Ligand binder design. Structure first.
Ligand SMILES: NC(=O)c1ccc[n+]([C@@H]2O[C@H](COP(=O)([O-])OP(=O)(O)OC[C@H]3O[C@@H](n4cnc5c(N)ncnc54)[C@H](OP(=O)(O)O)[C@@H]3O)[C@@H](O)[C@H]2O)c1
Ligand SMILES: NC(=O)c1ccc[n+]([C@@H]2O[C@H](COP(=O)([O-])OP(=O)(O)OC[C@H]3O[C@@H](n4cnc5c(N)ncnc54)[C@H](OP(=O)(O)O)[C@@H]3O)[C@@H](O)[C@H]2O)c1
Lengths: 545, 545
């Protein structure tokens, strides 16, 4: 019998290379497979050439037209799969796109910015939001449209990449939407676990092919690095050596067959004991799950810390919050630019700022991560006062509790709203501050960013986790890209920064703590190795005071 | 064809529940199995059972005698296996024994103590030392002997427990060695992986029996919680429910077959890519890898922080090291008991302390950790002096660098010495202080303990790493035992404490920085959530100063 005998399997991106190995292994294990592709012609071709190359019955292989980001197509596609076969025993979220292969400073956000990248003979065919919908959106959508038709003891397999947890210069667009999916897979496990549906996460390492060693050598050319630096990086993370392809034992890449044989194992009932589990098909590449630390001291700061420096604060709906952080920054003797998304809120706050009497060193302006063109202008304008922004604290876009609900249950707004405001806003802020610290590259101290999470929404911070994950990667890419550009002469000053997680603490005194430490990262001459830095549960206890 | 076709396996403790299951699946997938165990009569009876129950050719199975605590025994055993079949493809380190089932406070160290338990109708058969050798010794010795005869593409599998990273009540001698074994496997992952010998790590959850479901009713009785609390503890961690035993879907324990099927897979070439990997067959249990964080803060202290308080410092080989840590306490106004193993050191140190000018608040006494009856006696003499001991600080037993060499290429005595000195010293100091703080539950400040790592060996810190992950799980057991003893009104004062990792940083102040965070943890009113606290690489950078 076949380890997958009498099981309906759905494989997103079945036309691609791993796709077809998974389908091959599945048909040869006794599954009925439905192959999902954006195009019915390229997907049907990929289907028929698989029929040729295996010896399986036309009846045991099906295809269908699905595009994540178009939920109208994902419902119409699953439907056709339910009518046709009556259930989904195995989901394999393998669907994903390369993403714009540009550094953080040159990511195309608008369609005209992308058209403008096609005029420089580039191969990039995506916006950052296209890449999100294409990498992160498919998994989220397909999963939620499929979960109610997935019977007890069924399996979901979400195909990440090892590159989500490692530096991948000029690929901010590809990794952060994977890094998100990472936390989402875990959260989907927590919602579909009690229902008896397994959720498990495959991290394929760099995949062995003919192209790969040249694709890397090509990336090596990108950064002005001696060809082979990309490959050697990853080889040097690998602990395991192996003979593949009848070559000798060396540092090599894992195979498409290794990935397939895992998706056979994970799909099969042999794996029915595993949930929210990570499978790292990477030759034991040494990486950490979360490059983090919790704060074990009160942020002890002085009143001359910031003399000559100006912070930007990109605030969200809760401007009131932002201003509290602003306040402690001013208290350290730095200038502040509280950048609020509505102009409505620039009135209310500028006046309520006169009420408290914070007129010295603080300037409130409209600053809208939705529209970056103006975000650029606004920083040009502010610096004409002759002090340049030396550090940039970024708050979440949407008000706390704005995003809420089970990942499958959450509305068509939930994902699209989360993907656009939360992921694009972070990338736009990163591109915008990168572009600005390109121009004004002689600051008193090297430039420093800090991202900030919401406090605990107290519904289990489902969206707090996803965004911590995606942000943690965006910081790794940004730390790396700037450290490689700096060493090659292209910048004078290396951008560095951190992320502070508030949601591990529900105490009343948390914001002045969060904002306290925010100041230590920006204004003091520091480098914090760990990316994401958590606020302890109790602060009184965790520190001296 | 067999999924393990043409693979010589070696499964240690193959007579036990899982052992039978691993051999049964292995024979089905065409494996040639060598069963293993200290009792030949046992081993062979088992073999006969498995030869009937599975239609397996009696050629395709064999037995061999080996006690893991006894390396000679082990060298012989593999020698026959080698002689017979020529090589080892797969080595399953299933061998382990449930330790003494005794709470830290009542751990049996010397044979006489174990005999005092057996006249009590307790099922304890094992000293702490014995449990070490029975869980940790075996895995180390079987593997290191098997390695040479393992060809490339080879599989080592190490079977440990999830409970090695989660609290287990009065099961210190089970989980501590299981913890060392996790960190051992890691090192063996790295040392062999370059030879293409993959070394992965299975974490069984609670495994479905009739016995274990009552052993939780058993445990439940020892703490004094309602029966099914322990069941509901671990159930409450698991994200997955499942329909096992023909009972309707509910949170249920994983079957032995789930553990058996994984080895089939981990043994097989389908897993050619995975190395250093952890497989948790625990129904998606929610435990983190390690509860830890780096110090993003210089130790800030004050000159009265500890007046009226008293601190024990259990010293190892190198006492001058401990005496500088001791100066830092005294400086903070605490009193110091300096415990030195070798009675000769007492009068040597005594001079240095007058020469050095330290004469007030400091007492020096012989404090051998191989003599608890003496330890427990000396502490009572200091208490009679008039100040109870509020703070313990445990130094490593052996001199610096004395344990070295990659686990495989380790001297026969290096593993023996590491297990006895390091593991028993930590377990003994733990018992002795629990027993002392049971006797003195009315201290001015909660009682606080501090485990301090060696400084770097500058070689990878092989022993650094194993000894840390082990201590981390001793503390997690220590904290939870005092939490539950305090809640049920057995003890007024919650014991709590931390581990300080030093080997991460090489800087010249290194001793001062750790000696200073020891004083905080000891003499300040704080309860740090993270167990293991690392010194950061650069103290200049992490902390503004
Ligand atoms: N190969 C690697 O270097 C590597 C390394 C690590 C991880 N991975 C992961 O493996 C997956 C891809 O595997 P692969 O190497 O064989 O590449 P691939 O599958 O060729 O990737 C492109 C394919 O995915 C499908 N796809 C992409 N975006 C989609 C969307 N929004 N909606 C529907 N279908 C979509 C496309 O199908 P249609 O054209 O028919 O729509 C296309 O054939 C990705 O999820 C990736 O993160 C790959
Ligand atoms: N049951 C669970 O829920 C559970 C939970 C967590 C972890 N585990 C772990 O997974 C494995 C469980 O196997 P099991 O459930 O079948 O229990 P088990 O095998 O009955 O545990 C005892 C076995 O270990 C062997 N052993 C002990 N000391 C030894 C030594 N010095 N030399 C050689 N062999 C020795 C014994 O072999 P002989 O008596 O034949 O010499 C015996 O077969 C163990 O490693 C255990 O630590 C089990």
């Amino acid at each position: 019998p076949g380890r997958l005998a009498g099981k309906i399997a759905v494989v997103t991106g079945a036309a691609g290379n791993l796709g077809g190995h998974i389908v091959t292994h599945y048909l040869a294990e006794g599954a009925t497979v439905v192959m999902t592709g954006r195009t019915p012609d390229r997907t049907k071709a990929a289907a028929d050439a698989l029929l040729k190359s295996t010896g399986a019955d036309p009846s045991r292989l099906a295809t269908v037209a699905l595009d994540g980001g178009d939920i109208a197509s994902v419902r119409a596609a699953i439907a056709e799969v339910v009518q046709k076969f009556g259930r989904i025993d195995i989901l394999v979220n393998n669907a994903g796109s390369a993403g714009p292969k540009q550094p953080i400073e040159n990511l195309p956000l608008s369609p005209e910015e992308l058209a403008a990248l096609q005029k420089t003979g580039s191969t990039d065919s995506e916006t950052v939001a296209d890449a999100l919908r294409n990498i992160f959106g498919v998994a989220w959508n397909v999963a939620r449209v499929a979960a109610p038709h997935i019977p007890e003891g069924g399996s979901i397999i979400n195909v990440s990449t090892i590159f989500s947890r490692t530096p991948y210069y000029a690929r901010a667009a590809y990794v952060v939407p994977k890094a998100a999916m990472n936390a989402w897979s875990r959260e989907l496990s927590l919602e579909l676990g009690p229902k008896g549906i397994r959720v498990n996460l495959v991290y394929p390492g760099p995949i062995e092919s003919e192209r790969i060693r040249s694709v890397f050598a090509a990336m090596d050319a990108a950064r002005g690095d001696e060809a082979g630096t990309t490959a050697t990086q990853f080889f040097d993370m690998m602990s395991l050596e192996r003979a593949t392809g009848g070559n000798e034992k060396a540092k090599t890449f894992p195979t498409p067959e290794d990935i397939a044989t895992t998706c056979v194992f994970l799909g099969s009932d042999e794996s029915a004991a595993y949930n929210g589990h990570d499978f790292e098909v990477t030759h034991g590449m040494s990486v950490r799950k979360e490059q983090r630390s919790t704060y074990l001291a009160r942020p002890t700061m002085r009143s001359m810390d910031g003399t000559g420096l100006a912070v930007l604060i990109a605030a969200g709906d809760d401007w009131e919050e932002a201003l509290e952080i602003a306040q402690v920054q001013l208290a350290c003797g730095a200038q502040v630019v509280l950048g609020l998304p509505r102009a409505a809120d620039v009135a209310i706050a500028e006046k309520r700022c006169k009420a408290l009497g914070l007129t010295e060193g603080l300037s409130i302006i409209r600053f809208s991560r939705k529209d970056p063109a103006a975000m650029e202008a606004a920083l040009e304008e502010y610096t004409r006062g002759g002090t340049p922004i030396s550090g940039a604290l970024f708050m979440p876009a949407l008000g706390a509790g704005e995003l809420s609900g089970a990942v499958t249950e959450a509305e068509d707004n939930a994902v699209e709203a989360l993907m656009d405001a939360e992921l694009a806003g972070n990338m736009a802020l990163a591109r915008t501050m990168s572009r600005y610290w390109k121009r004004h590259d002689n600051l008193l101290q090297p430039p420093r960013f800090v991202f900030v999470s919401h406090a605990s929404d107290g519904k289990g911070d489902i969206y707090g986790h996803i965004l911590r994950a995606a942000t943690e990667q965006l910081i790794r890419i940004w730390r790396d890209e700037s450290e490689i550009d700096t060493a090659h002469g292209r910048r004078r000053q290396a951008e560095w920064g951190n992320q502070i997680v508030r949601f591990t603490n529900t105490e009343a005194e948390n914001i002045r703590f969060t904002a306290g430490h925010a100041a230590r990262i920006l204004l003091k001459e520091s480098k914090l190795g760990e990316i994401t830095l958590y606020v302890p549960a109790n602060i009184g206890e965790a520190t001296g005071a």
